[model samples]
Target: MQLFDLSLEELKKYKPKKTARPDFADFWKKSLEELRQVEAEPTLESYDYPVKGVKVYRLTYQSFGHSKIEGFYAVPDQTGPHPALVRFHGYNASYDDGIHDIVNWALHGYATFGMLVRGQGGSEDTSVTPGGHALGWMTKGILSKDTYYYRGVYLDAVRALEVIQSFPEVDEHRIGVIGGSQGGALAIAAAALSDIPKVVVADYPYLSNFERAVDVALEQPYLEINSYFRRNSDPEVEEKAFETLSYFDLINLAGWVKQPTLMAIGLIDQVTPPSTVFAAYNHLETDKELKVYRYFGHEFIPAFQTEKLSFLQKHLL
Candidate 1:
């Protein structure tokens, strides 16, 4: 499917919102700067639990300044400088306490690290912005710039890359990133912002061109923002919302990423519109491909995704 109907001129003509903090680059730079000050380096701690004979580790560390982000790390029993996959969790999932998709790449012979978004599992903490504008992390000063939702999550994404690259048993050069939904969006962002120089796989990604997403996404987080407008209806506030999103928009960062990328989306996905994913994919200047599932739902089915990952491994590793 065509990624976007609008021409480049139309896309630029369509202005999203301006970030509350005028300097978008500086915000992230300062945020990661804060994390550097904390000195809460990642500690590779192991979990006794085993999934299909995989050895698991509770990879915990500091991110977004003082905030902490924890995730699951697993490896196949035998190891050398194994290729790594930095994975992110779905909407409301856990990292170490429950069954998840983060370990799949590791089970397939890659070192995998699953980032537990701040408030999910045994690893719950406060955030600047919880989610969109309603349920998730929306309460996190949704009206402000510094305390935005993507602020924390995006920062943690970079930290996850740092942690994965630092894995003693992991081949830093072969590290890749993957996630679905919200996690998928962060994966795209991580590839743009981090310097690990690896592959990125995002399925039914959430964060991308704001205008397309706000128009077609009919689910929770995006719906939350729509609901906020329903109650408030403040034109100025609506403008501000767009402004904040533009700062985190993957389209703005796609050119910064030089690594290969793979993306997927269901044409009928109402949660994260296919157009939004395509918009991001089209802007990606590096080698990238989008696998379209014309009839799938938001999750895009697990079995097919495994095939996509195999392709990533074939080219990246």
Candidate 2:
């Protein structure tokens, strides 16, 4: 509950320069092309949870590199296409076995695809990229565009949104993305990579402004980068690692986000830090809003959830 990154005013004006590789555009273009080549359609199996008027089905789809991603897709009882949402989980987080939260989304009249990010939620990702990387998912294949951990996850995020669009109950024209922490990063990443999502809401997002995150984060996942540097202190390893990260920094991709977006952060938060969130928010070239919490830390402010719900209704409904 202490400010560790920057002053509130400083964060408001903090738009750092982009740090992507020279091939950033081509790298991502090929990534999407690779993802689109995966020829399997999403499969939905009826789950036993009956929520009065909502139907919940377990969603499974093949993503980049032959990985099978899994989650729950919930739709309202009616037949016409409805506004939809794609939900990504936090760092090391996954949905409950009961699959309860997604049902509420269905009851709200939006078809929801709560995709279990590959390698989370009690499962292993079958897909493997071309090279090796430092341990932990954050640095996995940290040196190449072809093998970085998020390269696959970002592609999977886009694929998740596409699955929502393909569902007969979901209106492709009115899709939205929402999540927090790592989920927040994915929401931004998904929208940046594809034009399907019409609205975006990310709270206390992680994985933005990577250099600053590594510099200021008093946390685990971001600290994972420092740990990689520790494994070997050579300047060569350091140079390659940081340069490789440029490709996945959310700020680099935030410029690609086209939807009207709402981003929020807890000013005193340590995990994800304050300035890093704004670094991406400032790069956002869209109709956008940022909510700052003076007293809260990394945890969700209950009141902001109401604001978020209201914001979604205004834009997505």
Candidate 3:
């Protein structure tokens, strides 16, 4: 409710220094090539749901390491060459109720695909981390860029685009991506690297400026990095961690995105600070808009969906 972050004027002027590694572009280019080497082998099976006028399918496709990535796909009963929407979830979460969650898009006559990030929800678990769901997932493989947890997740987001476009009923030219928090970060990052998507909606995106987040975030996930340093007591651990994170920071990737984007920020939120969200938003070089919710925390306002629906309608339909 109260403003603790920068004033809207300050946020407008905020441009944090870029932290990308010298090999950032090369690394991602190579990583996507590696994804192609793995056989996607996408599969879709019909599923029954109570929702009327929507056809649901259990969807699976191979991503990084040829691992099977799971999701739910929905299409309106009346459809051919329909615009498609790809949905991503937050960290350590999955699309257990995929049909119900994204059915609104289908109801609006858009083919929808909701992906479960690998190692979360009903998807495959390939994490080498010791702890289960809640605790150590953020720090899992934080020490290396190639092994970082998000490396696989980001790749999975990219692969989702490839799989969805292959469907004959999908209009590849009108693709869009949307998500909140971690999913929002993926949506932005996926749009940056892929030329397929035309619009993106990211709400309260996480994984923006890691250095700034660890400095200000009063939460468990960002605190996990702090906890790692406290336990290891290695003087160079922090530097090494940032080096790997530079490759994945959404702020750096934001420059690569040229599509229209809508980003939302919750000023009172501590989960993903407003400064960090703006850090990425400021770097966008395309037509973009931001909705500042002064009283909201990490949650979405009711108008958020309505605005996004209108934005997608103007662009995708």
Candidate 4:
């Protein structure tokens, strides 16, 4: 595609014209209030995995809207509160996709909670998306700022962070969140909306600058937006949807984050345009670092994994 996005230097300096709404802080704070009102009926059962020195548990908890979310929670076999990590799944994927990685995080001496985002891969979605219901989760409840899908999903992430903080084996003061793609957005959402996360690791995150995402994306989920605009050609609908989406955009949430965050992006990434990722990155008003992969895209960057581990070790330790 000949790198249609901004130049590398431009990307480093780019920030979306509308980074956030005036009520963005109030919206998140009000949204998070629902979690405290709901009792987190948490249950943890031992899971049969082959990893030694770490125990994996099948985890389920109640989140906003009283949704009984399910996921995998793992902790070191020994006692004492350890630094914890709360991870979100990539789009259309669930926590089970990272079972091995969760256990590995436990093995690395951190209590880890890997979540199954609602309604992906047969997981419960809190019953949420799209106008005429045609698009993916992106357009689900897109007509309103309050009923947006990610509003619930972001709360789901915060609830996981909240519930993880409840566990005695987790060192509440040193917890972190990490993920890539959609998971990366949740990492930022969880950290921004809540004060729990002390360190953040996000790579090639989806759902940053929403309007830009729909304009530049070459993939399934973001294409949902185009499908939406295609069907409901009314300019007012498009305006309203984007207005609702601004409340959930990572760029909007990024400014509220105060934690030490480590962000990564692939310049050639098609799924999440590098400029959109930078839209979120440049808005972060916190101690942060960015890793730019010049030749990479939206797929796995193994070296970034190594860098992620060190980033966690440096901050979470």
In the order shown, what is each candidate's alpha-carbon RMSD? 4.1, 1.6, 1.9, 1.7
Query: Among these predicted structures, which one has the highest lDDT?
Result: 3
Pairs clashing within candidate 3: none
Per-residue lDDT of 25-132 in model 2, one digit per residue for the tens? 999999889998996477889987856888889888888988888888888888768899988888876748326778887788788888787777643376564444
| Model 1, residue pairs in steric clash | 17-242, 17-243, 18-243, 130-137, 131-137, 131-138
Off by over 4 Å in 4: 95-97, 121-123, 128-131
**What are the Cα lDDT values of the candidates?**
0.71, 0.84, 0.85, 0.85
Candidates in order, TM-scores: namely 0.85, 0.95, 0.95, 0.95
Worst ten-residue run, lDDT, model 3?
127-136
Of 1 and 3, the candidate ahead on lDDT is: 3
In candidate 3, position 124 carries an lDDT of: 72
Question: What is the C-alpha lDDT profile of model 4 across 126-174, one tens digit per residue?
Answer: 5444447444677889898777888778888888998899888888999
Name the TM-score of candidate 3: 0.95
Q: How much is the lDDT of residue 35 in candidate 2?
A: 91
